């Protein structure tokens, strides 16, 4: 009953946002498409369906091809759902969730047969969605246009309580994986077995995480996109990175913990180290700061960390002006969280799409909106030691700074990354993973 | 070592294959095109990749896209292997894999940049593979020609020795797959915790499946393509059926068991005799055989099983003639299997495509090839109790002569399907499923 009260105005927030775009960009209204099962070449299977963000922005169903909204913003939200009635699939009943009696429901029976269900004159409706070629069929001639999609991207920062309160569940079953391969590598498991002892604890399928997770082992931990689940434990087990979320309605969790087997030595110490780093960082979000500048503090602290343990020797504002610092941590401070992992509209500077340039130094950055409240955000500092890019810093004028044989000595650890999702409030911080006593 | 001695057999027969096809039609040459990731709409991450079966027919690389070959049948086949050198993925090492001798190969780093490597003049070169405008944008005009296509799908049904080898391999991987199911089942677990015992069993996560596993409990098993996994038990245990396969080599395994929680009572018995049908239709399996002659004897044996259990109050002659055993065993005997689930070719009479019909009573069915040495099939009879077509049945005047009583009694079993892998060799059968001991 919670997130059913807090959804009345979530769909209230959606009405008003709709019909201020569809007004400003003469329309009539938004024909949001869910999508389609992508069929395999040359066969009779599917793709694991995928379900268009902006669909699910109105409603938690995730796993229905062929359903559409049609919004306008003054009128009820039309929903038209499909329901096939075939005996080899387990027939669902007609939507009674909480989510139900704010929709003016169609049911569809055969997908091809949509065309009597949307509006008959279509010169003024935008369809959202990916399926340009049956738009245009069905006699659509405005598609996913970008004034549209830049007004509703740059207003998915700000969540509504339903999408806060949503996060949070996503939060809780997460740290509930997290624990399980958490333990699982204590207990000397193979990355294939974490990933699936947190599958287990999930209560979540591979296809149902949000992103693909990462779970490496030892030197795997310094490739920051391995994707691999090897099914033999190495001989020696020396570190773990995880990084992996889970769903709740749509909305993505997404938390990273690094672990040093022996639970001493210096790699412990270093993870204990970028800890305190990454709490401060997640403490230092404030409306009113751009983002870019926490970025900037994470490359001060990654030298302060790199320049404390002796890997390179050299003051910490020295490491930073001659750019070592990006051999160690070559990936922005974190993003924007919400329906999608990466969330929508956290390069702009506005609601027309305008971007919001990034730091001097890191023009690669595409996290550098300007922090409000009800936005919801990663910090997920880094520090890995990776053989290409470590082979390039060892061919510049820095290579007689750098503590060669302390860094052979970290290779088989990989790295480190710590994540947490918080939440900005008008005059505090929720960190939702820290607050779930994961640790 | 074995695998990699009938691997050079394997090479031979698929350069005969292209020579004879590419000769009749006049071509230069196939380029066959891997794929590629598919991005998710609005989004960075991808679907999982599924390689191209035309391609994975060559060799066993069927993670990798932005792939090629190019292949006449009278030069040394030629590959583009995409091999990207990014610092965020695990750089692989060049192929040094049993199959790399037998190619030309050359290094791809950059996906667009693959026009340099495929032959200057394109004009009587086939593109096979599902990209029509991306070869279209590489200068191709020949995509998929029907008479290629159809010729290769027609001899994919004659297994080199390379093919069963890899087939054996995938089938004795889902057979640890299947014993821990079964267990797990016998230990009160949710179709979830037997699901994910099964990837544990077979080392294979969920998208390496073949297909996605059917794993039902109790009324689920009446609901053939059942494709959820209920995360709580049941209150009461009463079925398990579970269909899943595994992966080698980009060959299939399909095998399905029907187990009764009690091990007694009338269901109990009804897989007994399911299963003695079963194995006599596996034994059926005959060179010289239309299919289509053992999907008539099934409904005659199933017909035995509904007169004989007391479920349709008549003689199993008139079960068949009067269409009943439909209602009962609705989909096909089988089909063939090898690198896709359902293998192409099942339904051809001649190499041209001609389609071999279906027996007269039975114009659904498409696996109705005449059997023939090293050919790879499924024989998977089944009987169901399915409330939608037992509604339709209700409806006719053959009413009057169902035990609704006793379909009532039997409902929440759900059903039964039994599946083996059967390899047709000159002189005898190879069971593949059943010679590992699964029971
Ligand atoms: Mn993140
Ligand atoms: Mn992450
Ligand atoms: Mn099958
Ligand atoms: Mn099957």
């Given at each position: 009953?919670?997130?059913?009260?807090?959804?009345?105005?979530?769909?209230?927030?959606?009405?008003?946002?709709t019909?201020?775009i569809?007004?400003?960009?003469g329309?009539?209204?938004?024909v949001?498409?869910?999508?389609?099962?992508?069929r395999?070449?040359?066969?009779?299977?599917?793709?694991?369906?995928?379900?268009?963000?902006?669909?699910?922005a109105?409603?938690?169903?995730?796993d229905?091809?062929?359903?559409?909204?049609?919004v306008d913003?003054?009128?009820?939200?039309?929903?038209?759902?499909?329901?096939?009635?075939?005996?080899?699939?387990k027939?669902?009943?007609?939507?009674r969730?909480?989510?139900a009696?704010?929709?003016?429901?169609?049911?569809?029976?055969?997908p091809?047969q949509?065309?009597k269900?949307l509006?008959?004159?279509?010169?003024?409706?935008?369809?959202?969605?990916?399926?340009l070629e049956?738009?245009?069929?069905?006699?659509?001639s405005?598609?996913?246009?970008?004034?549209?999609?830049?007004?509703?991207?740059?207003?998915?920062?700000?969540?509504?309580?339903?999408?806060?309160?949503?996060?949070?569940?996503?939060?809780?079953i997460?740290?509930?994986?997290?624990?399980?391969?958490?333990?699982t590598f204590?207990?000397?498991?193979?990355?294939?077995?974490?990933?699936?002892?947190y599958l287990?604890?999930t209560?979540?399928?591979?296809n149902?995480?949000?992103y693909?997770?990462?779970?490496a082992?030892?030197?795997?931990?310094?490739?920051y996109?391995?994707?691999?689940?090897?099914?033999?434990?190495?001989?020696?087990?020396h570190?773990?990175?995880?990084d992996?979320?889970?769903?709740?309605?749509?909305?993505?969790?997404?938390?990273?913990?690094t672990?040093?087997?022996?639970?001493?030595?210096?790699?412990?110490?270093?993870?204990?180290?970028?800890?305190?780093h990454?709490?401060?960082?997640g403490?230092?979000?404030?409306?009113?700061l751009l983002?870019?500048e926490?970025h900037?503090?994470?490359?001060?602290?990654?030298?302060?960390?790199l320049?404390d343990?002796?890997?390179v020797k050299?003051?910490?504002?020295?490491?930073?002006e001659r750019?070592?610092?990006?051999?160690?941590?070559?990936h922005?401070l974190?993003?924007?969280?919400?329906?999608?992992?990466?969330?929508?509209?956290?390069?702009?500077?506005?609601?027309?799409?305008?971007?919001?340039?990034?730091?001097?130094?890191?023009?690669?950055?595409?996290c550098?909106?300007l922090?409000?409240?009800?936005?919801?955000?990663?910090?997920?500092?880094?520090?890995?030691?990776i053989?290409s890019?470590?082979?390039?810093?060892?061919?510049?004028?820095?290579?007689?700074?750098?503590?060669?044989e302390?860094?052979?000595?970290?290779k088989?650890?990989?790295?480190?990354?710590?994540?947490?999702?918080?939440?900005?409030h008008?005059?505090?911080?929720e960190?939702?993973?820290?607050?779930?006593?994961?640790?």
């Amino acid at each position: 009953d919670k997130l059913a009260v807090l959804y009345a105005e979530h769909i209230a927030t959606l009405q008003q946002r709709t019909r201020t775009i569809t007004e400003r960009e003469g329309l009539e209204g938004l024909v949001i498409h869910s999508g389609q099962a992508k069929r395999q070449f040359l066969d009779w299977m599917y793709y694991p369906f995928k379900v268009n963000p902006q669909f699910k922005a109105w409603l938690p169903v995730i796993d229905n091809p062929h359903c559409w909204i049609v919004v306008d913003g003054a009128s009820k939200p039309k929903l038209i759902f499909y329901r096939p009635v075939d005996f080899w699939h387990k027939v669902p009943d007609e939507p009674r969730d909480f989510w139900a009696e704010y929709f003016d429901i169609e049911l569809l029976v055969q997908p091809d047969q949509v065309e009597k269900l949307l509006p008959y004159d279509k010169a003024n409706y935008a369809y959202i969605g990916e399926y340009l070629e049956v738009a245009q069929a069905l006699g659509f001639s405005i598609m996913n246009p970008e004034p549209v999609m830049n007004y509703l991207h740059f207003h998915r920062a700000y969540k509504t309580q339903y999408e806060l309160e949503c996060l949070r569940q996503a939060n809780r079953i997460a740290v509930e994986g997290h624990k399980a391969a958490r333990d699982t590598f204590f207990n000397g498991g193979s990355e294939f077995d974490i990933q699936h002892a947190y599958l287990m604890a999930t209560r979540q399928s591979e296809n149902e995480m949000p992103y693909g997770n990462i779970v490496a082992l030892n030197e795997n931990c310094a490739i920051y996109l391995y994707t691999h689940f090897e099914p033999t434990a190495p001989h020696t087990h020396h570190s773990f990175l995880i990084d992996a979320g889970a769903n709740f309605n749509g909305y993505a969790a997404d938390i990273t913990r690094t672990y040093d087997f022996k639970k001493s030595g210096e790699f412990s110490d270093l993870i204990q180290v970028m800890t305190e780093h990454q709490i401060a960082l997640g403490k230092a979000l404030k409306p009113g700061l751009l983002y870019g500048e926490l970025h900037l503090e994470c490359h001060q602290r990654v030298a302060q960390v790199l320049s404390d343990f002796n890997i390179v020797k050299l003051p910490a504002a020295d490491i930073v002006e001659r750019g070592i610092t990006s051999t160690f941590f070559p990936h922005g401070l974190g993003h924007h969280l919400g329906l999608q992992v990466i969330d929508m509209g956290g390069f702009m500077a506005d609601e027309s799409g305008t971007h919001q340039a990034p730091p001097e130094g890191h023009p690669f950055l595409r996290c550098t909106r300007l922090i409000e409240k009800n936005q919801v955000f990663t910090i997920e500092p880094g520090l890995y030691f990776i053989d290409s890019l470590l082979g390039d810093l060892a061919q510049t004028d820095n290579k007689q700074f750098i503590n060669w044989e302390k860094v052979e000595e970290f290779k088989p650890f990989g790295g480190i990354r710590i994540e947490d999702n918080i939440i900005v409030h008008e005059d505090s911080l929720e960190n939702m993973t820290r607050d779930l006593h994961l640790d």
